[PDB]
Design a protein around this nucleic acid. Structure first.
Length: 80
DNA sequence: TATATGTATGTGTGTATATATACACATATATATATATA
């Protein structure tokens, strides 16, 4: 590690924090991406969202999913 | 046609009760707006 401090190279990994977050994290190139969690059902055509990505408020997400007219053409009602 | 005469509003003081709003700054994302293509 002292050698790596002299030459500025990385040995031990330094990952993002996943504490108090139930979704999953992926590295695609030079960035990290954080994913939510849904639960598909065709018996009652209802998707049950169970988690949002990191630092996403809930009512701002719901109003953003309500304003977009291309997405509103497939939903009847959106309930919290 | 002037007069009263009983109506109705209306700020104002101290000590309380509960809220509201404009602006700067960076950067990533967004949802609709737009040419001209035709």
């Amino acid at each position: 590690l002292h050698y790596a401090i002299k030459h500025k190279i990385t040995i031990l990994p330094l990952r993002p924090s996943n504490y108090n977050f139930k979704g999953h994290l992926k590295r695609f190139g030079q960035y990290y991406y954080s994913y939510g969690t849904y639960v598909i059902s065709e018996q009652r055509n209802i998707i049950t969202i169970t988690e949002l990505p990191l630092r996403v408020p809930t009512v701002a997400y719901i109003e953003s999913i309500k304003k977009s007219s291309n997405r509103m053409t497939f939903i009847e009602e959106i309930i919290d």
